[PDB]
């Protein structure tokens, strides 16, 4: 064949690609399908938040086209018969799948932008402009064509600077422009340079004398002026992405190529034996791969010029600081102002020797370089103020002395500042924004290759999927680094939000880590090919990517001291200010959900981050009963997130209802928990700086049950549930008068009560029984059965007390009532199961941890039926066997949760 | 509690039954301490 | 018995249950608060 079958399979690889290209921009029409947000404030910050978060997708998705689009022409650098074309259709695929993720990305932001300035069209138009300029590069990526290499590398530069001109129609051209057109200085002075060695190469070339040899010295030349000529055009399009690392090794990759070319070329040079043409061709050769090397040079410090680290030890700014007062308040002394000079300048030194000390250990010297800089304002201020302390107390009426002190104090102690801060946070700029960035891209990736993957059967009905099922769960997780990147970009000074980005990036390694193993996993399960390349190749970056999150997640948790405990209550006061705008809000009456929000969902939400917050509540009382520990301020920001997913879901579920009494309800129920929770950080300051008092330890305890009490108050706000706490009011109430000085007042006979104690315990179970009937009904249904119940139990509970005093021992009354205790502390766990399994009927297991306490009350009523009830007729053998045969037969109607923890074979003995 | 249950075991004492049960307020609060951090739902169940 | 054929089927899917069984625990819970009301009561028999 002219063309091989895997070229055969790369044309229906080219027909697969090219048809999703024009069917983008057909699908771009349809541009708004917007939502209405409204006049709430948390709709515009959920406006401030996909603006954000949405302009990092596509600035994400944009880098990988520009990896796979040189990388294709690194791939057919090579002559015919020796290109892997089957990795040539990976790169055109997530190219595709990246301008599938454009269209839907971009048509939420035409929605965005048509709401602020309406000035989003000439996006529109350069975006559909650029999938046009990759329509004609499939078009050149067909071999059986004889068009010409550079047909192909000048189509290709379009693509490239179309795309920064897309990034400059978005704005987040980050890279400046001085430093992307310097590529262009060098890219076209190395053709140049090749181009002047070529015709070096072909002047030898006339030397030459014997055959083979002419033609083996311009095959070269012409390889090597092709591969420059590529670099021409690969560097046209990595011009906007020198920051991305994943296409930086396609540069030293023909950069390689260009040295096999200089090596192939400069072993024909030395043929030219007794020439002097040899002696100018090694020197040029030289100079050919030094404009390689100087624009190597400055490709590292491309990546470095963003990425500064420095370490923040600050052993003697703290010495700095505490002598600066000494001066302004020992004003007008000629003794003692002279002494503090000294000591000064001995505080400042202390650090001059130890920032170059940590430029040593580092790795890259920009901030390094910049501590360089910090340090001479450090030792600068210090050498002005030691003549300006001479001439102040020498001379205490001159005002010109005095004046010129108060500057210098100033230009030392924030430039101290000025030398920490910058140390620090350009750190976690080398640390955080390359974390979340590149994470990003190899996020998404995965997803449009899985959803590729999913779509390459037939049928997707059950594909088993290792990523889909985690991928939905991590897509959550992305946003949530992302929107502290421009905070942290917006607030660098304030730690809080960046000590957020240390816990976002923790809480993304456990989901993230975990698919990368079954990215690998599901690597050989695809029939396809070229797809599983670029899953090799995402996971490599995967991996890539989370080598570097836990340098800077260990290192920035030993950035600063623990000192977490007071930030974790101004994070309560924003939400407190917000939830008052909302009770604002809620007092206009015409507030619009999120659209993610569900009413069914997020009352779930509401309980599971009410059950979370708790359980780190009595985490938070051991770390307090030791005093004194680091985690203290660890778990006090764990319940700062804790309430803020609770904020933000019960102001989700304020504006998806419409009644306004109860949205004052789930207001001051939710603003009396910060008022307890404002309470808790108050004491437990108070609690890490008094060590083994047993009175804080107590307090905070009776805080914490009300807190949980507080917590019960945004349980019994719900709507959904109905009178379930008004039965477990009538359940309990009655039982505790029937503990407490309970008498019968007429016993009447034996016979009469025995005859109606079986009769009132065969519908008191049979209405326990519909409780797991209504399972699988209404959760509604649920408080229905818990009314019906709770009264019949109320019923049963005066029946029951009403033979207690028939028996004539008061201790065998004792032990039924005793008995009658354990009956009804089983119904009200079984009461507390229904708070939960009404809030939540989802779960299997908690329908199995109902059911058990359904099997619990039952058993506990039929001994003490035994106990009381006469066994001489008989009838009563049979009586309790009936009532326990019903519940069983409804507990194998749900076969979702296991009984026991045996297996298989122990369950068949 | 142990040190107060050998105490009462055959004690048979009003005043000193009371010491087991006024030390059993930190035993129940450190047990419910715990099913508190059971039920956090992501230690406690995964679906299937 | 039935339940693990449901985990059977390939296409089903295992769950890790979470890292600790909250049945277990919900359990003991209630019971040692059933035996802390029957030492809530003054008058009892050492047995008991």
């Known amino acids: 064949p002219p063309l091989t079958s895997a070229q055969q399979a790369l044309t229906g690889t080219i027909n697969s690609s090219m048809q999703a290209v024009q069917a983008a921009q057909a699908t771009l029409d349809d541009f708004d399908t917007l939502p209405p947000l409204g006049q709430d404030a948390a709709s515009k910050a959920w406006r401030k938040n996909k603006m ?22 690194n791939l057919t650098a090579g002559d015919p018969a020796e290109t892997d074309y089957t990795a040539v259709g990976c790169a055109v695929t997530t190219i595709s799948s990246n301008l599938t993720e454009m269209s839907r990305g971009v048509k939420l932001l ?65 890279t400046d422009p001085h430093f992307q057109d310097a590529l262009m200085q060098l890219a076209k002075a190395v053709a140049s340079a090749a181009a002047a060695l070529v015709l070096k190469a072909k002047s030898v070339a006339q030397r030459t004398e014997d055959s083979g040899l002419q033609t083996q010295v311009i095959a070269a030349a012409t390889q090597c002026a092709l591969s420059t000529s590529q670099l021409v055009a690969c560097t046209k399009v990595v011009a906007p992405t020198i920051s991305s690392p994943v296409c930086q090794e396609q540069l030293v990759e023909a950069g390689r190529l260009v040295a096999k070319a200089v090596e192939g070329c400069v072993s024909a040079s030395q043929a030219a034996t007794e020439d002097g043409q040899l002696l100018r061709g090694v020197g040029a050769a030289a100079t050919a ?55 000064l300048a001995q505080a400042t030194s202390d650090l001059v020797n130890a920032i170059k000390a940590d430029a040593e250990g580092e790795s890259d010297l920009e901030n390094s370089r910049k501590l360089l800089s910090a340090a001479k304002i450090l030792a600068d201020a210090t050498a002005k103020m030691v003549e300006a302390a001479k001439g102040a107390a020498a001379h205490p009426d001159s005002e010109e002395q005095q004046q010129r002190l108060r500057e210098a104090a100033e230009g030392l102690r924030m430039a101290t500042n000025a030398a920490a801060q910058n140390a620090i946070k350009k750190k976690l700029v080398q640390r955080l924004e390359h974390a979340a960035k590149q994470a990003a891209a190899s996020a998404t990736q995965t997803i449009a290759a899985a959803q590729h993957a999913a779509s390459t059967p037939k049928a997707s009905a059950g594909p088993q999927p290792l990523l889909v099922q985690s991928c939905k769960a991590v897509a959550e997780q992305i946003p949530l680094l992302v929107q502290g990147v421009r905070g942290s970009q917006a607030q660098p000074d304030s730690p809080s939000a960046q000590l957020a980005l240390i816990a976002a990036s923790q809480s993304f390694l456990q989901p993230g880590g975990k698919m990368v193993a079954a990215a690998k996993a599901s690597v050989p399960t695809i029939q396809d090919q070229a797809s599983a390349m670029q899953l090799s190749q995402c996971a490599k970056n995967l991996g890539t990517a989370l080598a570097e999150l836990r340098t800077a997640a260990q290192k920035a948790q030993e950035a600063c001291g623990p000192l977490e405990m007071d930030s974790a209550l101004s994070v309560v006061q924003n939400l407190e200010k917000d939830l008052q705008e909302v009770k604002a809000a809620a007092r206009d009456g015409k507030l619009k959900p999120l659209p993610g929000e569900t009413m069914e969902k997020c009352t779930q939400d509401l309980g599971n981050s009410t059950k979370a917050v708790s359980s780190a509540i009595a985490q938070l009382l051991g770390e307090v009963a030791q005093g004194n520990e680091n985690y203290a301020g660890i778990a006090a920001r764990d319940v700062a997130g804790g309430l803020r997913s ?32 404002s309470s808790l950080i108050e004491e437990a300051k108070k609690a890490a700086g008094h060590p083994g008092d047993p009175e804080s330890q107590q307090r905070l305890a009776q805080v914490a049950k009300a807190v949980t009490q507080a917590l019960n108050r945004c349980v019994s706000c719900l709507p959904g549930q109905r009178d379930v706490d008004n039965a477990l009011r009538a359940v309990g109430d009655a039982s505790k008068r029937l503990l407490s000085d309970s008498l019968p007042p007429s016993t009447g006979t034996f016979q009469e009560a025995q005859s109606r104690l079986n009769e009132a315990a065969a519908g008191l179970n049979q209405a326990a029984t519909e409780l797991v009937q209504a399972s699988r009904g209404t959760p509604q249904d649920l408080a229905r059965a818990s009314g019906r119940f709770g009264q019949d139990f109320s019923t049963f509970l005066e029946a029951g007390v009403e033979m207690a005093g028939q028996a004539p021992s008061q201790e065998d009354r004792a032990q039924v009532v005793s008995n009658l205790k354990g009956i009804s502390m089983s119904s009200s766990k079984l009461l507390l199961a229904a708070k939960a399994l009404s809030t939540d009927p989802a779960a299997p297991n908690l329908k199995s941890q109902l059911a058990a306490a359904a099997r619990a009350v039952t058993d506990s009523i039929n001994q003490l039926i035994t106990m009381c009830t006469q066994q001489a007729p008989g009838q009563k053998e049979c009586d309790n066997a009936l009532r326990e045969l019903e519940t069983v037969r409804e507990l194998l109607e749900n076969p979702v949760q296991p009984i026991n923890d045996m297996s298989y074979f122990g369950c068949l003995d | 509690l142990v040190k107060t249950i050998k105490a009462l075991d055959g004690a048979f004492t009003e005043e000193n039954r009371a010491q087991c049960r006024a030390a059993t307020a930190p035993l129940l609060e450190a047990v419910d301490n715990l099913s508190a951090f059971a039920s956090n739902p992501e230690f406690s169940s995964i679906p299937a | 018995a039935a339940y693990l054929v449901g985990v059977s089927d390939p296409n089903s899917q295992a769950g890790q249950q979470g890292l600790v069984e909250p049945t277990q625990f919900a359990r003991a819970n209630q019971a040692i608060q059933m035996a802390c009301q029957s030492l809530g009561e003054p008058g009892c028999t050492q047995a008991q």
């Open chain 1, 52 to 73: 954000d978060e949405s302009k990092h997708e596509i600035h994400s998705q944009v880098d990988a086209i520009t990896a796979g689009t040189a990388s294709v022409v």
């Open chain 1, 110 to 174: 035409a929605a965005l932008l048509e709401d602020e300035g309406g000035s989003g069209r000439p996006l529109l138009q350069a975006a559909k402009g650029l999938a046009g300029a990759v329509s004609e590069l499939l078009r050149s990526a067909q071999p059986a064509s004889a068009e010409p290499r550079q047909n192909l590398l000048q189509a290709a530069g379009n693509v490239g600077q179309a795309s920064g001109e897309l990034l400059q129609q978005i704005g987040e051209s980050d």
């Open chain 1, 289 to 343: 791969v030094t404009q390689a090397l100087n624009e190597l040079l400055q490709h590292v410090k491309a990546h470095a010029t963003g990425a500064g680290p420095a370490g923040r030890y600050d052993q003697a700014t703290d010495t700095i600081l505490t002598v600066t007062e000494n001066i302004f308040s020992s004003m007008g002394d000629a003794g003692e102002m002279v002494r503090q000079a000294r000591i």
């Open chain 1, 646 to 677: 609770l904020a933000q879901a019960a102001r989700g579920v304020a504006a998806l209802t419409s009644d306004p009494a109860v949205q004052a309800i789930v207001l001051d129920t939710a603003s009396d928990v910060l008022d307890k929770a």
